[PDB]
Amino acid sequence: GMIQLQNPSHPTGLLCKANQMRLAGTLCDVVIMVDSQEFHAHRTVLACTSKMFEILFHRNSQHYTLDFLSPKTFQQILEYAYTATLQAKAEDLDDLLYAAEILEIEYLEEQCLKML
């Protein structure tokens, strides 16, 4: 007979380790520059979070500069991507919507749209 196992804590635990890796900078494979500020991250997490990054990463530069947002906004979207949670001042909502729109993060775009 067949056997089956399911762990509903895997997706979340997996993302948790990934964030822990990004904080220690372990196995990072891409550098995103934002206003002369370097961010080390994982292509896979970013590409699965944003269709914009999925497309962009087919260049294989391992290094990319973003001009549509400030390092603060990016750090804000990086945290969301790695923790599924975003913290931001009400005064940043516009900045986030503009970037979420370009990055195509449906959830951030939806929420920011409602909140405004």
Ligand SMILES: [Mg+2]
């Ligand atoms: Mg800039």
